[PDB]
Design a protein around this nucleic acid. Structure first.
Lengths: 145, 147
RNA sequence: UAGUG
RNA sequence: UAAAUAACCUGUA
């Protein structure tokens, strides 16, 4: 824990699939200096073998202003949020299927191939983030001083 | 160990029915545990012998994503959460009098899956709700990182 | 398009 | 009075 101290508070939403590695991804949701940073990792090898299970694919850096907006959705107030950079065009909105769940669909490029992806958020993974963000915004507004 | 935790020490006159359930959490990991009662009730505040049996103890380390699901239940965001791993098969549901965590778990130095069920009621359900809603918020490392 | 404790 | 049979390392730009 000497290391998890000095490191980016973060929380990974995990969705491995050794069954069909065509749905294997790992998102690290971290906050680095006023930066809510998303790292969509892809599975390049299986759980059963040795090695580095995950492999980092596209890293979406989110600017401070977004927290309140993302939260405005996680909290049922907005019906969607949009992100945009020369490298991504993603979206987070309430998943109509079940309540309290959300979907993040990011269509990233890479130096022009569009790498897109999609990560679903179950009622718990949503609550997961929901808190992660409230915390940041909490410290960002500097209450921890 | 010097972790956030709360224990419920239920000691009976019938050593077979007393237990010490401990709920603590290390970072993103909740550790639910229970040791049985080792023989009779101590009665000498000086007697520093073991009052609960650390060998028939029930230990279960949960995932980070679990700690989340558990709150769900407390918030009615999920009617009942059911996790399954190699060492146990449990469920955590909301009750009109509190919480219910049960399933088949298994003691240290065993492979004999035994039927298990621990409950959190009244003023204990409260206590447990606060511990969980807290584990989660502090489970991200913000407090330590900024300290 | 690329490289390291 | 714990728990216990090893491997989900970051930045840079």
């Amino acid at each position: 824990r000497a290391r998890r101290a000095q490191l980016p508070p973060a929380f990974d939403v995990v969705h491995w699939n050794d069954e069909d590695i065509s749905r294997g991804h790992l998102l690290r949701v971290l906050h680095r200096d006023t930066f809510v940073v998303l790292d969509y990792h892809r599975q390049a090898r299986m759980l059963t073998e040795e090695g580095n299970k995950a492999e980092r694919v596209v890293s979406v850096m989110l600017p401070a202003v977004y927290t309140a907006r993302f939260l405005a959705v996680l909290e049922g107030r907005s019906e969607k949020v949009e992100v945009h950079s020369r490298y991504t065009n993603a979206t987070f909105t309430p998943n109509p299927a079940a309540p309290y769940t959300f979907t993040l669909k990011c269509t990233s490029t890479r130096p022009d191939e569009t790498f897109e992806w999609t990560v679903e958020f179950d009622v718990a993974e949503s609550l997961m983030l929901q808190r992660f963000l409230t915390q940041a915004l909490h410290y960002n507004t500097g209450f921890a001083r | 160990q010097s972790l956030p935790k709360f224990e419920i020490h239920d000691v009976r006159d019938d050593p077979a029915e007393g237990t010490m359930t401990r709920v603590a959490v290390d970072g993103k990991l909740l550790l639910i545990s229970q040791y049985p009662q080792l023989g009779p009730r101590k009665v000498d505040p000086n007697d520093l012998s073991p009052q609960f049996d650390a060998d028939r103890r029930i230990s279960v380390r949960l995932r980070h994503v679990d700690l989340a699901y558990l709150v769900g239940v407390c918030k009615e965001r999920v009617p009942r959460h059911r996790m399954e791993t190699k060492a146990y098969t449990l469920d955590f549901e909301k009750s009109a009098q509190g919480y219910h965590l049960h399933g088949k778990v298994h003691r240290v130095a065993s492979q004999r899956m035994e039927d298990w069920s621990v409950k959190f009621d009244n003023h204990f359900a409260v206590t447990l709700e606060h511990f969980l809603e807290s584990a989660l918020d502090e489970s991200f490392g913000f407090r330590q990182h900024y300290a």
